[PDB]
Design an enzyme around this catalytic site. Structure first.
Site, PDB file in Angstrom:
ATOM      1  CG  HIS A  10      44.211  82.726  87.204  1.00 17.00           C
ATOM      2  ND1 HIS A  10      45.021  81.790  87.850  1.00 17.00           N
ATOM      3  CD2 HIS A  10      43.469  82.397  86.205  1.00 17.00           C
ATOM      4  CE1 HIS A  10      44.859  80.806  86.776  1.00 17.00           C
ATOM      5  NE2 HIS A  10      43.845  81.225  85.852  1.00 17.00           N
ATOM      6  N   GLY A  65      42.041  77.079  79.173  1.00 16.26           N
ATOM      7  CA  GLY A  65      41.002  76.321  79.559  1.00 16.26           C
ATOM      8  C   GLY A  65      41.122  75.261  80.805  1.00 16.26           C
ATOM      9  CB  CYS A  81      43.440  77.495  84.746  1.00 15.88           C
ATOM     10  SG  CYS A  81      44.545  78.170  83.840  1.00 15.88           S
TER      11      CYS A  81
END
Ligand code: KG9
Ligand code: KG9
Ligand code: CL
Lengths: 305, 305
Positions: free
Chosen positions: A41, A143, A145
């Protein structure tokens, strides 16, 4: 003496964390050999997340669209491909700090250490378990991820989790390092919810054995139970069924303390039906289920890495 | 979202751990630049520990009596000196993995990460606090002496604790990195016991502000209190006095949530009186005191839910 929620030393993993940027999106990557692994993503805008077609978004990207930063050094992306929900970026430099490693998929009830990162920089380390509903109760802000979960078996780092998203209840969802999600989740901005959770029975038993080893014996009693009668009581309190495999796995702790597994089950039954009556076990007023039998043995014997 | 007991990433500290041997005794050392720091009781036998005369035991030792092992490499000791309860061993090789560091002495209530080691090899990392009675509730087995406690705010490692001993109640005592013990403890096997422990009030308040930030307000009430009336109540529950310094320190968390410190003190008074009535706060059925105001700000989001 002492019993703490203990994470594995994070040094071997800190040396793999990088920052991955694609357009306006910034998240964390794992740099092993000449490949950077990160959530797919990273190629999406907030708008794309509503209904993303990842191959169509990826085909429009070139190698120079991905900015990979390791410390204050920029890495050069020379290739890109997708495997399930993970993006793999080929870089021109192999990571000189690459440890001995494996990618492993864990089962619910298994614990692991999380190295929470922001902008490719590690901020903290904590221990958690894969819940029976496949979520994890982590501590992650926007942030985070791409942050990873791991275990250390002898001298080998076993990567088991990569962080992708937060659910409305504040719990977290992610994939193994091959990009397969744990649980019925998808990497898309759409209505998703964690299912009802249960307590990891074999882990509560292991933690009761750790309390006995440390001198907390007030909950022991003269009684025993059958495996079938204990499971009827476990079903009533939202506890996972205890199998013969779990009984075998608890064998070493049963022999060390002199308390048979079905004898410890009768203690757990009484704690469920009556509570703690104002008392605590290992500094806790709740029954703790995020220590596996192996974690208990490891902490009560001093295994090093 | 989420709130976990979080330790600093341990990598910078793992690269400093060495094994120190003197005769039959083996413990851990901290290798910074060309000096190895370790507990001075490494020169003692079990017999010496009743009434040791360290100066007399040390004068009988030469540089080649100390064996220092870093990984599988042997270091050469070229000097030795004692500073308070710490032995400092000068070695022929400066540690190439020496991070940016400081030695800091902490106050009770302050938290830090512990990297538990055995034979110079790290086994685990956990978070803990300096109790008001100057002990720490660690998890340490025999061989853990010399393990260190630290914080890594920004890029600098601040070493604050070195492990020296376990008390009869199972709690732990140690020194700062200059060899000065925390508490009235001595590195001597004498009748020693920890003083009566108390709850770190400013930390429980910080943790209640964290629960509010993460979206929970069930424990709040319409009342306020004076600082003096709160202290008269709190000390009946074995809580440390809350000082004006603590009120000032809670200012930022108070402005973020919109709840005055003395309004949060009123909620704590009511929680102490009523208990939780089957409810939990941040996954806990007890009031947590091992998170400082600074730890809460570091972990929690800057936007309240
Ligand atoms: N429910 C929920 C929330 C997430 S979101 O709607 O902002 N979000 C949709 C989304 C959808 C799918 C995927 Cl794969 C990722 C993502 C992203 C994601 O979870 N990111 C995060 C991850 N971790 C911790 C976060 C904390 C705070 C904000 C984002 C966080 C972005 C509001 C928390
Ligand atoms: N009471 C007690 C115990 C320690 S002891 O009596 O064996 N002991 C006296 C002593 C006195 C002073 C000094 Cl400076 C060091 C020391 C040593 C010390 O504490 N070592 C340790 C340290 N940490 C965790 C331990 C766990 C288990 C066994 C040793 C442990 C040795 C049995 C726990
Ligand atoms: Cl301090």
């Amino acid at each position: 003496s002492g019993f703490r929620k203990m994470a594995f030393p994070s040094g071997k993993v800190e040396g793999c964390m990088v920052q991955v940027t694609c357009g306006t999106t910034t998240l964390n990557g794992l740099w092993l050999d000449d490949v950077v692994y990160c959530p797919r993503h990273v190629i999406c805008t907030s708008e794309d997340m509503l209904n993303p077609n990842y191959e169509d978004l990826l085909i429009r990207k070139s190698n120079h669209n991905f900015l990979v930063q390791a410390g204050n050094v920029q890495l050069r992306v020379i290739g890109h491909s997708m495997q399930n929900c993970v993006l793999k970026l080929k870089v021109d430099t192999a990571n000189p700090k690459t440890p001995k490693y494996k990618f492993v998929r864990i089962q619910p009830g298994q614990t692991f250490s999380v190295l929470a990162c922001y902008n490719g920089s590690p901020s903290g380390v904590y221990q958690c378990a894969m819940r029976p509903n496949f979520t994890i109760k982590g501590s992650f802000l926007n942030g985070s991820c791409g942050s990873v979960g791991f275990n250390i078996d002898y001298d080998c780092v076993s990567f088991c989790y990569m962080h992708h998203m937060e659910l409305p209840t504040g719990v977290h969802a992610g994939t193994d390092l091959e990009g397969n999600f744990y649980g019925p989740f998808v990497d898309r901005q759409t209505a998703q919810a964690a299912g009802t959770d249960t307590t990891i029975t074999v882990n509560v038993l292991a933690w009761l054995y750790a309390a006995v080893i440390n001198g907390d014996r007030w909950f022991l009693n003269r009684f025993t139970t059958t495996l079938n009668d204990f499971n009827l009581v476990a079903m009533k309190y939202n506890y996972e069924p205890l199998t013969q495999d779990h009984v075998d796995i608890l064998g070493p702790l049963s022999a060390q303390t002199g308390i048979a597994v079905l004898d410890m089950c009768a203690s757990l039954k009484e704690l469920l039906q009556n509570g703690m009556n104002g008392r605590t076990i290992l500094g806790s007023a709740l029954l703790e289920d995020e220590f596996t039998p192996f974690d208990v043995v490891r902490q009560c014997s001093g295994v090093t890495f």
